Subunit: 515 residues, 3 copies
């Protein structure tokens, strides 16, 4: 054996590639103009507390912006605050408050209805995208890293603009959204705050994924958007966990008043320079479905801030989930189904173990510990840090401090927000090689998750294991006005025989959707 | 209608692209050496307080570095500080203090003079570039996010190295620049600080835009740089707004002494491996011009920290701006023309509305509110967050706190620094399709800006609306020694008929300048 | 002279590149599965304090993950802590604690032994890579910015998860690694903390550089890993400099107990879709060598927090370093050879000057001041800020505060961690153009470094100037099982005549190694 001959190259700086008449060109520009925005009012008066069906109906010729936005404005009254609380860096909005407040939405484009679930869509998408991309969707794009929020915490998401490390990554007042706090009298136990939130609608077939440069829709003879409006305090208002309550009150009481809503769209004539618009335009419109869920009361007997190994290992196992084709990705999370406190972070469990069954293949990922489950999820787009994901004790030295008495340990204890595990069928390493993304092949799946919860010793709460699927799904816009959508399914043999793609395509006009 | 047939591909990791003799090559390197730096002294002794004309004159054969740097050193005495003030995280330099201190500069290259205005150039460029790119221009590249700077504020730009979230993005002591504080006696009301600032000169035709990998200049038989030196305390020294004054003093008094200045260049022989240097070398050298300005006294009757809707809507409208060709970009800002406090941030207004007239087309962008104006500016390179841009109350909870009395509300209130709106002619969405970037066509423009200011109720100040143009302008270096510069102008018909560019060029050597 | 004609293009958004059947394709996927992890125990019981030889021996067929990980777990008892110290944000691990604890490692692949020095490798690599890449190697990837760590410091690397600006970039508890603090009784002067660290092995031929997507090894009939285990407290445990000691104690006393260690690998069967594995696979496996070192006692007579110009200019000059070929990069650092405090940061000097001799060419880089040395090092991958690199006083206002008495100046004074200067032979700008990266040409090098140290006046310590080389070195895996490694050397004339590469290759499957 001998090493093979390797050819040589002489690297030199790009500065020596001299700009000349042979390699320089002057650009002019056309673009999507900003003189083209219009405000669409709903067909009837929106409910003053934001609870009820809301409908928009507006035909639009030519091009319509692919990421239309909903603009809500309202007053929130927060009661049962201890008298003369400063509330510095302690009040704000929850993450993606518009889409979190819409359990279901129906969009009609030229007689074709699209039914989707924005609250579910954004619940997954918020953990699975570039933060700067998410900041263009919502002014409240930052997601909670920890299960309790306190004023001093460094990345406290209710920090004001001047008190935040990055005001873009805060949901506090004086950050990305307009607000006004009503005057607070001395001795007052309540506060009124006006809000305005301009957020992109996360619902099929909108282009929330391509919010950087969204492909517009064309020639909408019929265009309706029907929302299940659930803009209730629990889906919007956030209060830090160290805000003190009035004596004899368990939780804060919040009321939404003066609720208004409009849809903001861009509408413009296509320029002649780009040429004739093609007969059939394709749009990436992912189908998210809850494949299975199951819950149980989880009772902690031992301290969650104590020895990590002695934390109560709660187990939930789904029923068999029948699927007629293979999704491109799955998402697993264990969350508190009925929250105790309405305005605190979403209580997710720290998943410490995961075993998966697919048809006859059993015990997949059984060997994996938290670090590898984090690595797995991160490799499929999970956008947060291990301190959050793990659900482990985040401030052990603060709690272990002997100055903190035994009765106040739990109060001081702050945990990571919890786990969301994204996995693809290729990660499973199935000996059945026909089980591949977008394969037209039926399968049965069962998911068991072992997890730890942040509740104190002698207390408990209900937790639900959820398994979602993210299927590749396209929407087709035909020249005659018709809209259709379908899954992109092929036989195992087609996909196995297809050409390899180890890199991006050299032709930059090409797009490779799904997988 | 039926969905079209789509071809399939099988994606696999880059790890499976095995390195072999067929796809591996070994590199060696040549580069711009670091043994090549020269210090050029000015022709005469520089003024000890940094006020006056400063001239460099140095012929240089072969290749000269495209981004030459000015290195200033001086002592600053700050007086009227309250006795025994700690000054922790409260003293530093303003952003780009070298270029901010040069209102005009003349560079001569082989008989061709280039006249530019560095203070204007950098005032725009600081808001319109990648932060890491800007950190290579100046050690004081961080721009103010808020109109008042206080010691506690999280991104306080006078935070010391150990107290900063990112010492690169601070302008404090113990960050990117050398300094020395003279010993402070107990009871002293003044402090002396030595500074040294090594900053790239932002003046045509220097390659401040391509600071990463600048294209060098060749064979400078004549090379002169003539600066209007205005290195005043007001253009350099920063003092936090919560530093307390001596009794009976309105503002701090600052004196510059021991001012020295040199120019740092790289000069080297071109390597033979890159081949013959081409006959004509092209350089990107943007032309920034103040197209129009107008000002007025703006009196606030209502509190700026009060109801945002009731903040005084000040209006300024430019005269008709005649232009013989169409610039690629415009910039609009409303700024305080005579500052009250000399060492505080530049007070910009929060622009809440913008009406633009171009020829017979009137009322463009009238529908746009702050979020969309921010989106517009950000899409054309604006590099700061909404909390800053908006000019809105940044710390509402701190101010609304009942512990803060009515007389101290204003003192506690901190606002966003204010708006800078970048827009292209394509953003306007004009009926007249001949109005395109780099079109050789005459136009008349008028700009009206509606804005709010940060001054208290019963006070006011003078604010000037400025409308800048950023024209595409190239500098040509001919083999015989001649330098020329010209705008890159073409007929509307030429530009309309040109080939479309939806993506970057596949050939990596190709540059596409302007647009 | 006249400007040349330049061709025009019309730029337009990527949204107008409509997705159609002509430019869209649907992907399916294969990937490196997560069902494939194995835990390998060592051949004998690991030493309970982590001191001794540790050997792994495990044959592995098919594909083995190119970046195998070592997982250490242990208990650390820290004694001599002042009674009832809170220890908030004051205890954690040093950077890369696994690899720092291994002075030498031998890896056997099918009879071919690779001897490397992980502690040296990571000492350089931690300063010379993308932080997000480094975070995948170790949970303690953040490197010290300053020579002293205090609790209040903004980027204090022992900040807990909830107290960190970025928990990924902290080495504190409740961040990237599992831990447990044993209960602390009132009046206790010691604390016991369990740790678990899962860290990639940095040793030839592992793919620690390509940690994102590592190329796996194949068909290991013999696979042994022999470690010089030096998992001692000084290489792992970190204690903040403002933690107070028990009366009559000079330093903290720490000992390791319950030490265990395993190796985590991925092992899987290559999928048939990628085709036949090529005969010879190439791996990038850089060779780092200590070319020369020299030391001396460095006594500071004047205050390091005083006038920067009056700080003692210590000089160290290496002996002549004979090398038979030209390395692609060099690294220079001046470090404290025997630390005074065992659990504080590594004390590096601030290098203010650097003279280099190569053969008959003397005084290279003699003109360069600290800003240019920082620029030089950063252009070759140095990943930290000037505040750190310079070694200058980081908190001058804090120290110059008259409230701080003359005797407490040094205690308050915090300095940048110090300099690491990376330079290539092309940076030197030698007359002798045959001295190029990977040239098979012998040379003699001498390096002189002028530097300042952070020790107080009337004290001193031993500092060693180290000069490392980073040679391009490839490992070849032959189909018959054989492994070889060699430097990639060519004649000067071969490299000079090779084709120019001003940009990346258009073919994305091509790799260009070294240079």
């Amino acid at each position: 054996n001998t090493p093979p001959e390797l050819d040589t190259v002489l690297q030199a700086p790009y500065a020596y590639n001299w700009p000349t008449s042979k390699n320089v060109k002057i650009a002019s520009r056309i673009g999507i103009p900003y003189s083209t925005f219009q405000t669409i009012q709903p067909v009837s008066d929106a409910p003053n507390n934001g609870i009820g069906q809301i409908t928009f109906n507006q035909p639009l010729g030519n091009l319509t912006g692919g990421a239309p936005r909903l603009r809500v404005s309202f007053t929130a009254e927060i009661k049962n605050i201890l008298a003369d609380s400063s509330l510095k860096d302690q009040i704000g909005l929850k993450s993606f408050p518009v889409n979190r407040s819409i359990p279901v939405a129906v969009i009609n484009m030229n007689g074709k209805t699209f039914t989707s679930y924005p609250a579910q869509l954004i619940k997954l998408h918020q953990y699975n995208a570039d933060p700067l991309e998410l900041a263009l969707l919502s002014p409240c794009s930052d997601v909670d890293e920890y299960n309790k929020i306190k004023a001093v915490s460094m990345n406290n998401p209710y920090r004001q603009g001047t008190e935040s490390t990055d005001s873009r990554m805060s949901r506090g007042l004086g950050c990305n959204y307009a607000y006004y706090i009503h005057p607070r009298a001395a001795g007052s136990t309540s506060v009124k705050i006006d809000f305005v939130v301009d957020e992109a609608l996360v619902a099929n077939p909108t282009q929330y994924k391509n919010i950087k440069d969204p492909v517009p829709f064309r020639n909408l003879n019929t265009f309706k958007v029907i929302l299940d409006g659930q803009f209730k305090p629990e889906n919007m208002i956030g209060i830090a966990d160290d805000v003190k309550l009035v004596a004899g009150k368990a939780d804060f009481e919040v009321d939404i008043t003066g609720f208004k809503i409009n849809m903001l769209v861009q509408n413009w004539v296509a320029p002649l320079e780009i040429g004739d618009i093609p007969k059939t335009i394709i749009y990436n419109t992912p189908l998210i479905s809850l494949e299975g869920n199951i819950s149980s009361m989880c009772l902690n007997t031992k301290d969650p801030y104590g020895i990590p190994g002695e934390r109560n290992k709660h187990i939930l196992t789904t029923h068999s989930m029948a699927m007629n084709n293979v999704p491109s990705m799955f998402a697993v999370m264990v969350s508190q189904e009925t929250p105790t406190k309405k305005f605190a972070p979403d209580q997710l469990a720290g998943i410490i173990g995961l075993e998966i069954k697919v048809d006859s293949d059993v015990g997949i990922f059984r060997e994996l510990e938290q670090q590898q489950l984090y690595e797995l999820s991160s490799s499929n787009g999970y956008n947060k840090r291990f301190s959050c994901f793990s659900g482990a004790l985040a401030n052990g030295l603060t709690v272990a401090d002997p100055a903190v008495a035994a009765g106040n340990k739990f109060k001081e204890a702050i945990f990571g927000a919890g786990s969301v595990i994204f996995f693809r069928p290729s990660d499973l390493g199935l000996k059945d090689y026909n089980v591949m993304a977008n394969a037209n092949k039926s399968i049965n799946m069962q998911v068991q998750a072992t997890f730890v919860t942040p509740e104190a010793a002698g207390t408990g709460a209900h937790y639900k294991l959820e398994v979602f699927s993210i299927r590749d799904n396209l929407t087709y816009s035909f020249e005659d006005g018709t809209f259709m959508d379908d899954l992109t399914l092929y036989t195992p043999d087609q996909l196995l025989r297809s050409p390899l793609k180890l890199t991006d395509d050299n032709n930059k006009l090409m797009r490779v959707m799904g997988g």
